[PDB]
Design an enzyme around this catalytic site. Structure first.
Site, PDB file in Angstrom:
ATOM      1  N   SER A 263       0.894  -1.322   0.133  1.00  0.00           N
ATOM      2  CA  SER A 263       0.022   0.065   0.120  1.00  0.00           C
ATOM      3  C   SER A 263       1.241   1.354   0.000  1.00  0.00           C
ATOM      4  O   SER A 263       0.359   2.107  -0.424  1.00  0.00           O
ATOM      5  CB  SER A 263      -0.890   0.103   1.277  1.00  0.00           C
TER       6      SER A 263
ATOM      7  N   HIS B 205       1.810   4.081   7.781  1.00  0.00           N
ATOM      8  CA  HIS B 205       1.700   4.595   6.453  1.00  0.00           C
ATOM      9  C   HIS B 205       2.137   6.228   6.543  1.00  0.00           C
ATOM     10  O   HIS B 205       1.723   6.656   7.633  1.00  0.00           O
ATOM     11  CB  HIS B 205       0.528   4.562   5.678  1.00  0.00           C
TER      12      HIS B 205
ATOM     13  N   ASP C  65      -0.519   7.376   9.976  1.00  0.00           N
ATOM     14  CA  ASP C  65      -0.769   6.414  10.907  1.00  0.00           C
ATOM     15  C   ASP C  65       0.323   5.788  11.256  1.00  0.00           C
ATOM     16  O   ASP C  65       1.412   5.794  10.701  1.00  0.00           O
ATOM     17  CB  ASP C  65      -2.204   5.657  10.402  1.00  0.00           C
TER      18      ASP C  65
END
Ligand SMILES: [Mg+2]
Ligand SMILES: [Mg+2]
Ligand SMILES: [Mg+2]
Lengths: 319, 319, 321
Positions: B16, B248, B245
């Site tokens: 991601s 990430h 967060d």
């Protein structure tokens, strides 16, 4: 002086003599680093890749350029590999495969196989002598392979107790096909390889001679007819006797390949070709070194400033 | 000063944090344009791609060079992913997979599966807890997976009510395999992933540390043993707390990656490597700017003209 | 002046007008050598590649850059290609496929098909009019196609005597799908194409207009909305009348493409793009020629040498007097 394209947009397609990852260096002929993609497998070839012996080692170049150094192993294909009635000859199958690896936009994909009844999917050694996927049909049926409009080659091997193709009784063994096939009254086991698809043919290669320790079989010998063929060191067509064994590590082949792959300062990005002769190859442009021009500017400035000193004194002494 | 190869012959392999196409920019760590091929997927990893969650998102680099920034998601594989008797350990499966993505000539292909009787092909969530392709064998039979001679890794998951491997009773769950498998007396459902084929291993990569928000699992921690491993910003091995967060958008990771990918004027065409230290990297050749050398000439010339005048003046002044 | 990236990291994605290997030269529009990878097939398109007519000719670019010159053939898809209930529209199918070929990290892979009974695998002309792989189901059953979590498009064609999707009665014909599918109480024959997987979308292309001999169908006309679209020679939107026939070999298209692919001395390695305007394109650097700098030095040195001679005559002509 031959220069072979040694660059990341090139795939080297080889056998044990180029299988740097998996073969002891004493048996390698490619003993220099290749800046492109290396697809080389001990024991393999463009026909042998379809046999099932090396089920994960299909050749799948995706680059614009290729260099081929393989073929010796394809001479283990023989009459039993073209014995199914209507099979391509090995001469024609090899021609299509070598043209495809050299020039082709190629893929390896699953080949269609179907039938008028449900077949049993399994694996067996009984068809080829080593483990491959088969369909088993325990009663006689119509079996169909490939699809109209296909563009590529696949291998079929059978162990049949009955069957015919267009009324011609099947013969057990293998064959190569580049069209759809239909067997009638078929009972027994059938292996079908993946298809080596060959679509467009505007990629480019060099095809380096692959010699065996005996005279080449016809279907690999004929690669001499391709425009891309380039001779490699040999003794009357046979692999040289200056290696680790009769088939690997030739000192003269090594030198031939290393020299051709280490031409200095070639700007491969500026030629659309898998090789060039050294004098004609495009050369890298280098940084200009201006230190010598600067030294001249200093040496001149020295004589000038001293010419100014001299002139003033002559000017005063003339007053 | 690290420079990473930012070039069309390089594939960036990520999760991601690099999935520029599909993840909100606030969660990205790769926030600069990558000139090569980007293969990065939310939630994915080299093990997780085999779970069944990612049927269309397998990693398939075909370029000479790779940069890896992934692994954190692979730490959700655990004991139940190596519980089928004779399964590879996660440590060994991860090692083969990370070596394959880094160095390998790789493909993703269907895995052979067969049996002594005809079963049913369907999809169900009963094996893994989420919908995947399964084969159902409602009567005890022999089930075979993979083929002798294969070179790659696949994942198997079972929900069986009977069966054994070589006489060892099966345990429900999953395992990773790089050899053919045979289950005897098998009744139940089986998921088999595609195979991540790893053939030759002469492609090249950098392997950038992927940190989790707790210490890495053993099978990803061990990537530090690979020559290609390069540390990325972390706090005692844990992902930094300077991001969007806990997992990430780290400001410090972003700066590390952006800096390494924007080294100015590197001629990647002249180095066979996925990275270099800046001072040692080959630099682009530029047109030479002769303006300062030309100005130096003009100054000399102005002075020499004066000397020409003053000399003539001395000569005449000898009146 | 448009310059198209003519380089080994670029894939040219085309139809008969670019199928240099297999099409008679009078019908080609791409008549200059392309230094990248050429994937072009007579009669094909990004939708037509799923029809089964060209089973070995799926488009599979793996390079960072692409140039597209295709679409005219995709206008032969029509209402019967989106008639299965819940099928994508052709507008949406084409949009996803053209974005995928242009920008996508793509693959072509087998599509999952399963069922509550064993499907009979065969081939037949009865579903589409030409030979494709089908499964035959002779008992009403559940048929499932595709997988949860998939990212791509596939084509389905059916010849059913019964069946429904979510309670909606099936209609024979075809449809495009980008999600898993389930038919209940299905009986008959089903063709399922391979999946054109589209994952990330950070590769780059130019999309050159592909004109037909009539105005474009809606689902290809809409490619004009994509940032990468570039116009090609046309007469009121239709293929020019200066070719071998109404659809191929246009003299003006040929010149347009050859000119754009033969910009001199472009260093494509220094630009991350599938095209550039000539004056803005990076140019190859050449070896520096120092001859004028050397001539200037030599000229100066000759003069300074005459000054040495004349100074000495002076320096002496005074010591005398
Ligand atoms: Mg010749
Ligand atoms: Mg000077
Ligand atoms: Mg626009």
């Amino acid at each position: 002086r031959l220069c072979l394209r040694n660059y990341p947009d090139t795939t080297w397609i080889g056998d044990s003599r180029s299988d740097q990852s998996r073969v002891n260096p004493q048996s390698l002929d490619l003993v220099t680093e290749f800046k492109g993609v290396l697809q080389a497998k001990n024991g393999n070839g463009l026909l042998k890749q379809m046999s099932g012996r090396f089920p994960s080692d299909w050749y799948t170049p995706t680059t614009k350029y290729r260099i081929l150094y393989l073929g010796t192993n394809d001479c283990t294909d023989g009459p039993t590999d073209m014995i199914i009635p209507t099979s391509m000859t090995l001469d024609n199958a090899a021609r299509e495969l070598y043209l495809g690896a050299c020039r082709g936009d190629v893929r390896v994909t699953p080949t269609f196989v179907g039938a008028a009844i449900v077949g049993l999917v399994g694996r067996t050694d009984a068809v080829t002598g080593f483990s491959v996927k088969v369909l088993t049909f325990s009663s006689p049926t119509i079996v169909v392979v490939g699809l109209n409009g296909m563009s590529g080659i696949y291998k079929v091997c059978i162990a049949a107790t009955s069957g015919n193709v267009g009324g011609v009784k099947l013969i057990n063994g293998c064959g190569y096909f580049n069209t759809p096939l239909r067997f009638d009254n078929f009972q027994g086991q059938i292996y079908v390889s993946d298809t080596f698809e060959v679509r467009g043919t505007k990629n480019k290669c060099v095809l380096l001679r692959s010699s065996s320790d005996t005279p080449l079989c016809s279907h690999i010998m004929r690669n001499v007819e391709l425009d891309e063929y380039v001779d490699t060191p040999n003794t009357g067509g046979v692999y040289p006797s200056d290696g680790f064994d009769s088939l690997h590590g030739s000192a003269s082949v090594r030198t031939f390949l290393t020299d051709a792959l280490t031409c200095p300062d070639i700007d491969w990005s500026r030629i659309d070709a898998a090789s060039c002769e050294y004098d004609s190859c495009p050369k890298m442009v280098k940084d200009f070194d201006q230190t010598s021009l600067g030294n001249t500017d200093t040496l001149i400035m020295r004589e000038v400033a001293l010419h100014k000193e001299m002139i003033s004194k002559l000017q005063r002494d003339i007053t």
